[PDB]
Symmetry: C3
Subunit: 229 residues, 3 copies
Amino acid sequence: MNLESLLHWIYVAGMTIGALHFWSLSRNPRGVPQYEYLVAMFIPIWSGLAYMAMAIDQGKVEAAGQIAHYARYIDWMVTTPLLLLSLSWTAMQFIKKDWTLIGFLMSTQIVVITSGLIADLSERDWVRYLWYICGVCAFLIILWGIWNPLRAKTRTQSSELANLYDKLVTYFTVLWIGYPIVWIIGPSGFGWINQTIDTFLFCLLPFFSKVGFSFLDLHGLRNLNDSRQ
Amino acid sequence: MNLESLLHWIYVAGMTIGALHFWSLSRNPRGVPQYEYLVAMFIPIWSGLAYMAMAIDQGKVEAAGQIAHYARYIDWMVTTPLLLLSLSWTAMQFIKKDWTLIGFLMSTQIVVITSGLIADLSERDWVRYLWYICGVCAFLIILWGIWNPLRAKTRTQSSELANLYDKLVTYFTVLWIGYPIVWIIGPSGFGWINQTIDTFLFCLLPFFSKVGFSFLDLHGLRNLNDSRQ
Amino acid sequence: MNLESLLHWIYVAGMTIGALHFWSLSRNPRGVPQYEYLVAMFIPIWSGLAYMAMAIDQGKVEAAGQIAHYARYIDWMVTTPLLLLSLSWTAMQFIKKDWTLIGFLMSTQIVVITSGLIADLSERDWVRYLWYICGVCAFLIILWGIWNPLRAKTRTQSSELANLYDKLVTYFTVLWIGYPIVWIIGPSGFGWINQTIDTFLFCLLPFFSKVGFSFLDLHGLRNLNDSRQ
Ligand SMILES: *C/C=C(C)/C=C/C=C(C)/C=C/C1=C(C)CCCC1(C)C
Ligand SMILES: *C/C=C(C)/C=C/C=C(C)/C=C/C1=C(C)CCCC1(C)C
Ligand SMILES: *C/C=C(C)/C=C/C=C(C)/C=C/C1=C(C)CCCC1(C)C
């Protein structure tokens, strides 16, 4: 709008080349799940065009003098659900049983996204303080509910898979808790920081959450097979 | 906090403890297997935080002087689809190449929800009368279309499962028809009612709709086994 | 109030009887099994009620003196995904372990519709010029990515099915490119054409698309097999 703001723009170029990297990297999975990078390719693609809008200021609406971050949560409505789901496929190379684990995960997932949905669509800073806690609370019960079965449930299913998923949830906990932290104080919450740095922070974090997550999947399996015939 | 309600607040309270009641009953289920409780667990959870918002007045926008209840249909945009799907899994234990039945019910479902979607997002009381007929219309075609195949198509598939379903659709119709009733005249009710009582009626109805199906599914199967191997 | 455009009213009318024509013809289809008609049944029904609203002037919002085509893209959020999906099932009769081809086209379609939303939700004719390019940009990358495997990948998979899909994508490409064309110049895209014509054109195109693909699906298989008794 007023130019001199190529922050969200450069972000776009970063996500674009990100997926292209896998295009030439196809030399990879040669007899092993291709779908792995497939879903991991769509995640950055969609999320890429999203930030592109944040640059052209196409997605915000003026309501009661308060700027609504509609496009902000939107991106967190498509990438997040697929980010946690991408982990389900990573561990489960084959499924046919009932939907108890993936289901309980998808359910609590909806309630969480809902929190951030209105969190950014908050007109008053007083009402936002309540919805914020509502989000961490839901994540508090599920977190403790998944900690025990992290190795207790797979005690009879698969011990090896337990170790892999053990470190997998480790990082998943640091990132998911990362956002809530910045939401505590500062801009868009309770601070004396300019609204400029506000977006500048919520931009680098996601990018830091995508990259780190990518290397995680590659380190999870760590295997190079060559068989398809 | 100037709004004297505290009703929507007490609603979410009893909802939280509702799902927790099962957490303690996990020692052993009754009537239906774990997976059944899984879906029946997410229904109250999400719908719970929803009402909590209705208390803090979080979910209402003023446009042209007319208030919109976008938060109201939202709760009926998540629970309802799962209310129609939950019952589907109640009768169908295993699935492979049979999806024509679930696909036909899911499709007509989207049409109904869409009705209530705009029904509340109406700016004029004149246009609302038109969109209303549209909702009941599609409901009358699917109803008469599901009444006959209730025991006609299941005459060869399964006669036992036919009787069960016959009792299911019974309470399913009286409820689905209950809402459009109050939707007839008056301020979203039977008329001669205020705005306060209005939200109160649409509050108890869902609570009566959720609790009804809960005990319905349990009594539906009524097996009570004790095998785990 | 104040009638002027009854085209949308007559649009839904012929749409209702359209799906009903197959209701009586259910005694026997045009070759494709009942399931094929199932998905093909929801496409017209839903789209019917959509236009019906356009007639009652319910779906557009007056903001900044500009008219928003909210309901316009809405139908392109549910119908479009089903327009291609229906074709996916037509080619893939049975499925077990794949989620490669389907999962690919599905993701690419998510980013496409996205641009279609903001396209009509644009507040400026300048920003809408950039968002559009994004839509066609992703369409070209995926197009060239499906052209080569359209016969290369199916060279060993299925030669017979390859030919069927070869002609399927042909018409699918013309229509998909059809809209982008009209979006270039004219109304809602820098032009001296009346606004009344804008809707008149964007209404006849979908109707030309739906009917076109309908006959296509029936011509794709063109075979009769009686095996039930
Ligand atoms: C790629 C972008 C990602 C993975 C963004 C993730 C955002 C979250 C996991 C946010 C979580 C939150 C809570 C758990 C409590 C409520 C506040 C939120 C939305 C920041
Ligand atoms: C748990 C909440 C539920 C099950 C809410 C259900 C709401 C309906 C079944 C509404 C149905 C309607 C029609 C059938 C006609 C159009 C008006 C509606 C939306 C009230
Ligand atoms: C039944 C209605 C249909 C199938 C409508 C389809 C619309 C499209 C395929 C639009 C495609 C577009 C692009 C590929 C980029 C330019 C923007 C759009 C939305 C016109």
